[PDB]
Amino acid sequence: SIDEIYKYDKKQQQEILAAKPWTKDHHYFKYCKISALALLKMVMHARSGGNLEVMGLMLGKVDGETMIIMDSFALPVEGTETRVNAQAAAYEYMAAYIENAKQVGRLENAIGWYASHPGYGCWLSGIDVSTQMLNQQFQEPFVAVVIDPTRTISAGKVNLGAFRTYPKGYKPPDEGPSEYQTIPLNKIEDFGVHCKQYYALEVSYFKSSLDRKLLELLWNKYWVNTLSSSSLLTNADYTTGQVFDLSEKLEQSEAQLGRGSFMLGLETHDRKSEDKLAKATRDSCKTTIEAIHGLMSQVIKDKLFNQIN
């Protein structure tokens, strides 16, 4: 059932919020499901911000290890945040909008915050980490989503990440692919200082009626120029960096395996090594299938156009 996810069960949410399973595991939340509406709104806000960072709130819910997102809304930022934080008259519009949604139907409460990084990638800065750590202390089920309007245009695919922080003092396990990202020199220092204080969630969608309609319409409308070359992957950057990350991860796994071959009776090492190899394989397979799809479209369209008759 495509529309099953849109059903809101208030008592079930209250039961989950009373249970607090995330207190039993700091890696509890692993997946982030984002609605088409949410994605579109967030991307539009980020690109209207242009080269300036904007932010908003995300409405949604939790389901097992998965955090869901549905909505998002701007807060009065008089004089581009002339006061502390991008809030000013924040919950003024927020609480009104919230009571108004309890009135017109929307009952999904705050599930997180989104912020934009125009032209400098998706990750959490020191300020972002402090903000998310605070959000993980009051509204425990919160997620820091970062978007990139400039990379959305450059690479073609929307650059989006979902993140959760670790509590002060707590160390992550050895397991950690950590995809490589191009970070400008004015941001790389802060990135490196805080990159191990949080982790990235797996961001996934679920199709839907919102998708079906939106996608079909805009697609036909603007894709009459269906060519757009055919390979926006031609830019080395993305592909090259992904392949480099894969190589690094696999070489690290090999170094581990070589040292673990001496220790007889370490099952955990074998477990993490197998998992890392498997993650590397799936990442490579997704890249390969994307390239294959691009080639398929290119070949079909080019053959149709050039020598049809």
Partner 1 sequence: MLIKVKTLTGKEIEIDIEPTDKVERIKERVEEKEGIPPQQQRLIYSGKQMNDEKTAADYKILGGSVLHLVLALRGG
Partner 2 sequence: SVMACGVTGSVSVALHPLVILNISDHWIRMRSQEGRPVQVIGALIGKQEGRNIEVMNSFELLSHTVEEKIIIDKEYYYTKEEQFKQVFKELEFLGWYTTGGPPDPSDIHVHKQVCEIIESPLFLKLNPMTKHTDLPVSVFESVIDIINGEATMLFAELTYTLATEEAERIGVDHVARMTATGSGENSTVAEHLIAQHSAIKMLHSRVKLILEYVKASEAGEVPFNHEILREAYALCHCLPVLSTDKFKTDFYDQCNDVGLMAYLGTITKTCNTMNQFVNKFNVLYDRQ
Partner 3 sequence: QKVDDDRKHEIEAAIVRIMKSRKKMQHNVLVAEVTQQLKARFLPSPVVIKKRIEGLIEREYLARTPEDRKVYTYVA
Rg, C-alpha atoms of the chain: 22
Per-residue x/- track, 124-143, Zn ion (CB under 5 A)? -x--x---------------
Q: Which of residues 80-99 bind partner 1 (CB under 8 A)?
A: 81, 83-92, 94-96, 99
Break the chain down into helix, strand, coil percent, rounded to 5: 50, 15, 35
Q: How far is the CB of 188 from partner 3 (least distance, A)?
A: 11
- Contacted entry of partner 2, Zn ion, partner 3, none for residue 298, CB cut-off 5 to 8 Å set by kind: partner 2
CB of 109 to partner 2, least distance (A): 15
Q: Cα-Cα-Cα-Cα dihedral of 192, 170, 141, 86, to 10°? A: -40
Stretch of residues binding partner 2 (CB under 8 A), selected from 14-22, 58-66, 184-192, 217-225: 217-225
Tell me the window of 5-13, 24-32, 122-130, 282-290 that interacts with partner 3 (CB under 8 A).
Answer: 122-130
Give the integer Cα–Cα distance in Å for 147 and 112. 14
Q: Which does 125 bind (CB under 5 to 8 A by kind): Zn ion, partner 2, partner 1, none?
A: Zn ion
Q: Which residue lies nearer to partner 3 by CB, 127 or 215?
A: 127
Count the neighbouring beta carbons within 10 Å of the beta carbon of residue 25. Answer: 10
Q: Does 215 bind partner 1 (CB under 8 A)?
A: no
Q: Does 127 bind partner 2 (CB under 8 A)?
A: no
Number of residues that bind Zn ion (CB under 5 A): 3
Total residues interacting with partner 1, rule: CB under 8 A:
21
Sheet holding 66-73, edge to edge: 198-200, 159-165, 143-148, 109-116, 55-63, 66-73, 31-34, 202-204
Q: Half-sphere exposure of 74 toward its Cβ, with a 13 Å CA cutoff? A: 15
Closest residue by Cα to residue 201 from 61, 54, 34 = 34
- Say whether residue 289 binds partner 2 (CB under 8 A): yes
Applying CB under 8 A, does 189 fall inside the site for partner 3? yes
Burial code (b: 16+ CB inside 10 Å, e: under 16) for 71-110 equals bbebbebeeebeeeebebeeeeebeebbeebeeeeeebbb
Are 277 and 251 spatial neighbours (Cβ–Cβ below 8 Å)? Answer: no
First to last CA, the chain: 45
Contact stretch for partner 2 (CB under 8 A) within 85-93, 118-126, 176-184, 190-198: 85-93
Q: Can residue 252 be called a binding residue for Zn ion (CB under 5 A)? A: no
Q: Min. distance of Cβ 175 from Zn ion in angstroms? A: 25
Give the x-and-dash track for 38-67 against partner 2 (CB under 8 A).
-xxx-xx--xx-------------------
